[PDB]
Write a structure and sequence with these properties.
Layout: E1 8-14, E2 27-31, H1 35-46, E3 57-62, E4 66-70, H2 81-97, E5 101-109, H3 116-127, E6 132-137, H4 143-153, E7 161-163, H5 170-177
Parallel strand pairs: 2-4, 2-5, 5-6, 6-7
Antiparallel strand pairs: 1-3, 3-4
């Protein structure tokens, strides 16, 4: 679609719905285990580097056409019940309130099985009928590895699953997003 690099900026890093941006723009949230795998994906998708930072939901304005919301990675344990609950509430606040949210991209590593965290996250999203595009990353390094994830996820048939290298697959992904964007 009409997506230009350098018409991209971090609007705000937020915590509460109080600190979120008010806009008319559709929001695609990005979720997965790792902050680093997700940052690389955003940068690969926009054709920049050191745009995506790394805590916070980071709201990136994508050329006044959509917002990409980087959701803190769920893969790293905390110990503090306060820290745990603070994270859990941040996600739930976003997913259940945010009227702007139209689609979640979940990043899973194509090399391995999905973690229990990946499975529970996908099932959290299905409980609220959030449309979900599962992207299987680090594709270089397929066919059986994708089905392994789809089955372990137990995917809704309305949801798509696709493979990716963080070039080639960026326009396919923009075409899957586009119906969810206004």
């Amino acid at each position: 679609m009409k997506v230009n690099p350098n018409n991209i900026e971090l609007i705000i890093s937020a915590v509460k719905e109080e600190q979120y941006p008010e806009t008319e723009l559709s929001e695609v949230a990005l979720s997965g285990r790792s902050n680093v795998g997700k940052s690389t994906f955003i940068n690969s998708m926009i054709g920049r580097k050191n745009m995506a930072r790394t805590q916070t939901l980071n709201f990136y304005n994508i050329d006044e056409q959509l917002i990409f919301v980087d959701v803190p990675g769920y893969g790293y344990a905390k110990v503090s019940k306060t820290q745990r609950e603070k994270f859990g509430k941040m996600i739930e606040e976003y997913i259940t309130k945010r009227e702007n949210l139209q689609l979640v991209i979940q990043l899973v590593d194509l090399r391995h099985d999905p973690t229990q965290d990946d499975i529970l996250m996908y099932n959290y999203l299905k409980h609220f009928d959030i449309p979900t595009l599962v992207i299987c990353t680090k594709e270089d390094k397929v066919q059986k590895h994708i089905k392994n994830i789809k089955t372990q996820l137990d995917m809704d048939p309305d949801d798509t699953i696709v493979s990716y290298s963080s070039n080639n697959k960026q326009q396919q992904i923009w075409n899957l997003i586009e119906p969810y964007i206004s």
